[PDB]
Amino acid sequence: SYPYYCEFFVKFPNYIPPKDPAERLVDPRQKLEPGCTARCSLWVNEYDACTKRVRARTDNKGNCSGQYEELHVCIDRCVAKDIFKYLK
Amino acid sequence: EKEPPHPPSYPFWFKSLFHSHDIPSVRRGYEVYRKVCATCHSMEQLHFRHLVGEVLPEKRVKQIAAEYDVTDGPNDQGEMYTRPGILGDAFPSPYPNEEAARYANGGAYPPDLSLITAARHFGPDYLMALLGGYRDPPEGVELRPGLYWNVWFPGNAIAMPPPLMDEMIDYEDGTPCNISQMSKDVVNFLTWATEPTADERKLYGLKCVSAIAIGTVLMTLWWRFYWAMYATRRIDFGKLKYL
Amino acid sequence: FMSLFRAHLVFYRCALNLNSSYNFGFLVAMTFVLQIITGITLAFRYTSEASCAFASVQHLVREVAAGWEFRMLHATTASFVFLCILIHMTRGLYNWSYSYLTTAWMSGLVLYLLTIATAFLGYVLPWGQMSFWGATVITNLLSPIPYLVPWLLGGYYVSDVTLKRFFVLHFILPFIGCIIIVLHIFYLHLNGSSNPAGIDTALKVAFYPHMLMTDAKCLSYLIGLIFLQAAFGLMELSHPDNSIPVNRFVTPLHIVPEWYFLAYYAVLKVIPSKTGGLLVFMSSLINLGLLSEIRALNTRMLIRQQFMTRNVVSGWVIIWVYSMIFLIIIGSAIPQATYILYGRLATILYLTTGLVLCLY
Amino acid sequence: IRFGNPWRDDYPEWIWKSLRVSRKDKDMFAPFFKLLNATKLYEYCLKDNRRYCMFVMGVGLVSSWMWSEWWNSVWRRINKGKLYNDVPYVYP
Amino acid sequence: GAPKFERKMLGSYPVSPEFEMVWRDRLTAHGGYIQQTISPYQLKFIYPFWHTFFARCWCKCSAYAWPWVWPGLITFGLVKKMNHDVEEDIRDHYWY
Amino acid sequence: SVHSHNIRPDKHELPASEVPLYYNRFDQADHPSLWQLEEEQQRKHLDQEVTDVSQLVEPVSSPHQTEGWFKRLRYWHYKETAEPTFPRTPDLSKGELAAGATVTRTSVWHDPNEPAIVSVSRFAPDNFRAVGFAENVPNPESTNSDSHPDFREYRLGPGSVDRRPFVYFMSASYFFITASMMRSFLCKWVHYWWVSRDMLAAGTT
Amino acid sequence: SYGNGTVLMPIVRRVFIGALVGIYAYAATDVVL
């Protein structure tokens, strides 16, 4: 029944100016995704391994949604830690 | 089924007890709604007069309202007509009824966004994540036309196409546009639109909770004042011991 | 009536060792007062017409001066009504207060049922998705009783006629409750209150000023916590789906009632039979009522002190409290075979603890 | 272990000592009570209930106004740059 | 109220209505007693609370340890075991 | 009163004349005035000095007594079970109690070398006292312990400052805060009663 | 007992007990027996 629920101990970040204003015409998520992809590598491997087990089955059953969801959730949580530093 | 994942906590300014809305960002999010989202979504509870003195000045709101054609009547002959909009009019809706909306969106109904941040779990954090969660499908999942894969939407299969893409509108204040900037701005606008009385509510609460707390201290002292006369009392049986 | 006022609120004598566990009866009463004041005020601008009810609440918040304050205070205070009652009832089970305050216990149980019914009626009025679908379900658990449903609604479904009559009943029942509070107090002051140690004693003092100032101190905390939650929204007491208009042909993904109804809603969910689940409901109320006659269930003479202090076997009321908490968690979860297994484990404790309270 | 144990529980020796401490005939806050009593607020404003109630209503009227004004200033300082009046809108 | 053999009054003046509840709980002071009380205007009334803080806190917390804390830790542990079996049961049925 | 007793027969809770629960050893005085001599010639445990919980006297009562399913408390004394027509005769040689029905409906009080009027005069309840009575039962001298503080530690005596001005400034401050709270709630109620923001605008044209 | 007017609660006691014996006997015959 509320638009939002207030929180305690939130860290409000400081804006990081760019070098060339034209640099921020691309989504600054691209700069943070590689580093966040390496820290969630424990799930990158569980997904690649589940694809092989499904590609080998004879019948047309099986999927990798479970491992895929966990992987990309890990990355989004890593990006949120710093994304607002580059947004006005 | 399973429990959907909890969205991450983004540091929105309004989340603190002592903070207000960020009006410069609310302004930019209203441009995003008008030029992208309003093509499929209505906000039937909002009126142009709600923006005056809180987001935009009066003369600017008039110019925006007049750019629309609004139906009014009946006239002296019992007929309907159209005229430019005024401050008293509601935000224009793209479809007349729900059946017409589904017909134009493959059977799916785009919901009204007048209370959207109060109508979903986790509210603004969910909306921010949703808008940047479109991915290619995983191995073994094939979707039919009209459906798209999203990390945060329950079931993963959503009927809304990706609404945002880098470089598509030009803000008026010169802020460079990108998918992440537009997401943060449109969320701020929709949070304000869910309850424009949020700032009045929070500022009154600070004055009240602080006053009540001080009175609670005073009543504690007045209670202990009377507690001590019976906590330090002496009662002797038989004979008097000490004075 | 001023001689009654001074006899019962000024010169009434009380044991010196009272503490805050004996202050929550006053707090509940004050919550009723606040609800009556804010409720009547909301009624001046509410519309029972189903086609316009949902809109009248929003317009009240968005357009009317101070409209947000009366709406949010009424919703928050309702949660504090049930928290105070729960602490109030638990004190009695810890001290075996029903041993000699028999009619006070029974009268209280009637007040509890009246408050449950009032809250259920009020939650349907805003006429959102959870209003409609929660009433449809909770009114079907009573289907085993013949024809107890189609008449309360006056139609073939929770239609627009049900909403008009839930408004009148919701208006009326609180004032009936105020009548029964008078009986409650009659039966209490007939015997006099107990104390935390469970002994008779002649070390008593007058209510005013010593004990009156403790009630006042607790009132301050209550008003401050209500306003804190109401004006800032720290906890999530309401469900978001009720901010969506009713749709009769689309069920929401997760149906769950308010927190103060969750535990028993979970018990009824882990029992597959529909008739056996309602019998479980009656047996629980019957057990609570039978405690009024605990003196007669065994020829050994009972004592009020139950010796939970430093005791490793704990007490039955404590074990019940944790089983209730455990079920609130189950009730808020998506159905899953594993959740159902543990939910049945806790249901056994939830029920057995009640039954063994009648043994000593 | 004595804490919580019905076979051994007793206060340690350092708690029995705290109960024996004595501060009889000492008052470190006395200079504060002397200042209050020298203003004669009791003789002129609190000894008579009619005047006591004049003091309540009058002081409450003025204090409530200063309290609101102060909180509004704090609110504006914490939120500098985010409120409507702080960012004039520029027309195209 | 009090038992009948305690409610019996020594005097004969009538009970006034504002005092009906006082005399419904009359109790005889078997053996007698001597009472001394000081005016609250001549007492320190906050220092006594803190002077006895450690003793009062020990008494209360010691009483509650076994009966409340020990069942709470067990309930907390069961909550974790439950959540660990739910996750494993989801992967044994839906994950490949 | 509004409370009834529960004196009835019971097949599981046998009568006290057969299962007493309490420790059934009692002394017996010829005339209750003799107990005053017992109280001045016997020693009391509370007059000895002990320092550790482990040195406290051990009760003569046994902890093994009440049994049953879900019976949390394990020690009791008294019960209201009805006594039969012909109760068991107390054995005075073992210290058993004789009182109530066990005096009226048994021959426990007969003495071959005394008149009946003399013998039965020694069987009133004031004539019996449980073993351990004089050594144990406390009789306090005050509510207050010498190990605890009282008003002597906290009293403001000569040389002290007057507190009246502070006590009444405390209460007055609470009231001008509570008065402001009330005035604000009433002003908000009146605003709610007045016209709304949507209708004030419609009037302007 | 003789001397007081608490005359309804003893009736409530016997009705409640009887009701409980019937609820838990109707469930056993459906699950066990």
Ligand SMILES: CCCCCCCCCCCCCCCCCC(=O)OC[C@H](COP(=O)([O-])OCC(O)COP(=O)([O-])OC[C@@H](COC(=O)CCCCCCCCCCCCCCCCC)OC(=O)CCCCCCCCCCCCCCCCC)OC(=O)CCCCCCCCCCCCCCCCC
């Ligand atoms: C500075 C930097 C910042 C830090 C500082 C802090 C900053 C924050 C702000 C400042 C905060 C402090 C300010 C100063 C405060 C001064 C006042 C103060 O100390 O207050 C305490 C003071 C205590 O009273 P007291 O007279 O001193 O002593 C009473 C005795 O304790 C009564 O005992 P008794 O022996 O006489 O009676 C016996 C029995 C009689 O029974 C009762 O009295 C009733 C029942 C009491 C128990 C309550 C629990 C049962 C209810 C459950 C509710 C479930 C909710 C459902 C929702 C669940 C959702 C999941 O009661 C009990 O048994 C009571 C003991 C309970 C102990 C509980 C032990 C819990 C153990 C947990 C173990 C966990 C293990 C797992 C760990 C995992 C992680 C490792 O209370 C008040 O003065 C009350 C004022 C407020 C009134 C209430 C208004 C709000 C209503 C909502 C809250 C309800 C609860 C309120 C407490 C109730 C107490 C009974």
Ligand SMILES: CCCCCCCCCCCCCCCCCC(=O)OC[C@H](COP(=O)([O-])OCC(O)COP(=O)([O-])OC[C@@H](COC(=O)CCCCCCCCCCCCCCCCC)OC(=O)CCCCCCCCCCCCCCCCC)OC(=O)CCCCCCCCCCCCCCCCC
């Ligand atoms: C976390 C939140 C909770 C609050 C904070 C934590 C709680 C403690 C705070 C400190 C207060 C106590 C200070 C020591 C005792 C003072 C009295 C006294 O006798 O002392 C001398 C006494 C020995 O002196 P003596 O020579 O024997 O006797 C001298 C007297 O004649 C003896 O005469 P008497 O015994 O008859 O009494 C003398 C009398 C006379 O006292 C005076 O001197 C008169 C003073 C007049 C003013 C009264 C205070 C009013 C303040 C209201 C707020 C400001 C309003 C103004 C505008 C503000 C605008 C921003 O004392 C009073 O009336 C005490 C006044 C102070 C009340 C406490 C105020 C605390 C809150 C302050 C801020 C307001 C709340 C926040 C809301 C606002 C902001 C958002 O020593 C002690 O009592 C032992 C001291 C050790 C105890 C302190 C332990 C502190 C640590 C435990 C707490 C830890 C945190 C919480 C843990 C639990 C939750 C997790």
Ligand SMILES: CCCCCCCCCCCCCCCCCC(=O)OC[C@H](COP(=O)([O-])OCC(O)COP(=O)([O-])OC[C@@H](COC(=O)CCCCCCCCCCCCCCCCC)OC(=O)CCCCCCCCCCCCCCCCC)OC(=O)CCCCCCCCCCCCCCCCC
């Ligand atoms: C093919 C598979 C078949 C599976 C089915 C099961 C088949 C079992 C076959 C077993 C065959 C061999 C054994 C035969 C034994 C026969 C005993 C008998 O009849 O009594 C003779 C004989 C009868 O003579 P009596 O003169 O009547 O003596 C009675 C005593 O005086 C009594 O009084 P007392 O004063 O001497 O004792 C003190 C008294 C009083 O003590 C107290 O009050 C103290 C209590 C302290 C508690 C402190 C707790 C603190 C910690 C709390 C932790 C947190 C919890 C809360 C948080 C929760 C959060 C969610 O203690 C009690 O009341 C003990 C309570 C025992 C409760 C056990 C209940 C288990 C129920 C299991 C479920 C059943 C189905 C349920 C319904 C399902 C849906 C339809 O009794 C004895 O001599 C004593 C024997 C006692 C034995 C008890 C344990 C038996 C366990 C059997 C095995 C069960 C296995 C189940 C799982 C199987 C999985 C495959």
Ligand SMILES: CCCCCCCCCCCCCCCCCC(=O)OC[C@H](COP(=O)([O-])OCC(O)COP(=O)([O-])OC[C@@H](COC(=O)CCCCCCCCCCCCCCCCC)OC(=O)CCCCCCCCCCCCCCCCC)OC(=O)CCCCCCCCCCCCCCCCC
């Ligand atoms: C005054 C000074 C101040 C200034 C002036 C103030 C002015 C205002 C004052 C008023 C002025 C106007 C006069 C008003 C007169 C009102 C009548 C009156 O005074 O009568 C007192 C009169 C006592 O007179 P007395 O002179 O004190 O003693 C009578 C004897 O001489 C001696 O009898 P005893 O001592 O041996 O025992 C007496 C005992 C006798 O106790 C009983 O017989 C038990 C009564 C309660 C039973 C229900 C409690 C829960 C039990 C467990 C669940 C059972 C379920 C059913 C199945 C059972 C198994 C088959 O009674 C009590 O304990 C008293 C309880 C208070 C009842 C008051 C209710 C009045 C009617 C309004 C009811 C509204 C209900 C709304 C809430 C529900 C909405 C859905 O009370 C009664 O005997 C009437 C009992 C009525 C019971 C109604 C129960 C309704 C609810 C049942 C449960 C339904 C659950 C369904 C769930 C469905 C879920 C979907």
Ligand SMILES: CCCCCCCCCCCCCCCCCC(=O)OC[C@H](COP(=O)([O-])OCC[N+](C)(C)C)OC(=O)CCCCCCCCCCCCCCCCC
């Ligand atoms: C007609 C009534 C007033 C209505 C209009 C005014 C607005 C109402 C809002 C409050 C305004 C402030 C109160 C007025 C000032 C009173 C001062 C006065 O004369 O008092 C004498 C005195 C003043 O304090 P004193 O006792 O120190 O004064 C002694 C006398 N002198 C100082 C002059 C030497 O107060 C008392 O006697 C106090 C009695 C105990 C009351 C404690 C109050 C706490 C309340 C706890 C119970 C909860 C109540 C809620 C009930 C709800 C029921 C539904």
Ligand code: HEC
């Ligand atoms: C037509 C091309 C659309 C545009 C442009 C926008 N939205 Fe939309 N939206 C559309 C449909 C058909 C749906 C239904 C999806 C389904 O599978 O049912 C939606 C849904 C939403 C939602 C609800 C999400 C939920 O959890 O239910 C939101 C919050 C939403 N849309 C927001 C939104 C925003 C911010 C837009 C501008 C950036 C926007 N939409 C544009 C159709 C269309």
Ligand code: HEM
């Ligand atoms: C103990 C007393 C009361 C309780 C527990 C109670 C409870 C509730 C609850 C839970 C709601 C729903 C709130 C929401 O989610 O929006 C509600 C709404 C409402 N109540 Fe009350 N109520 C009480 C007394 C009253 C009284 C006495 C009246 C009128 C005389 C009243 C009038 C209303 C109205 C008009 C609404 C609809 C407005 C809304 O939903 O916000 N209430 N009540």
Ligand code: HEM
């Ligand atoms: C509107 C609801 C209720 C109100 C207003 C209310 C009010 C009160 C008040 C003021 C007291 C005396 C102060 C106190 O002990 O807290 C009291 C005592 C008592 N109440 Fe309640 N009560 C309510 C509900 C209940 C319920 C639900 C029960 C039990 C099911 C109950 C049982 C008792 C008992 C047994 C006492 C006496 C406690 C004792 O002295 O040991 N009451 N009530």
Ligand SMILES: COc1cc2[nH]c(C)c(-c3ccc(Oc4ccc(OC(F)(F)F)cc4)cc3)c(=O)c2cc1Cl
């Ligand atoms: C040992 O200590 C206790 C035992 C207790 N036992 C019981 C049975 C209850 C109780 C009574 C009535 C009730 O009413 C109900 C509302 C709603 C429903 O249905 C549904 F679905 F939840 F809405 C069912 C029922 C819900 C719960 C208690 O409060 C209770 C409290 C304490 Cl302290």
Ligand SMILES: [Mg+2]
């Ligand atoms: Mg008994």
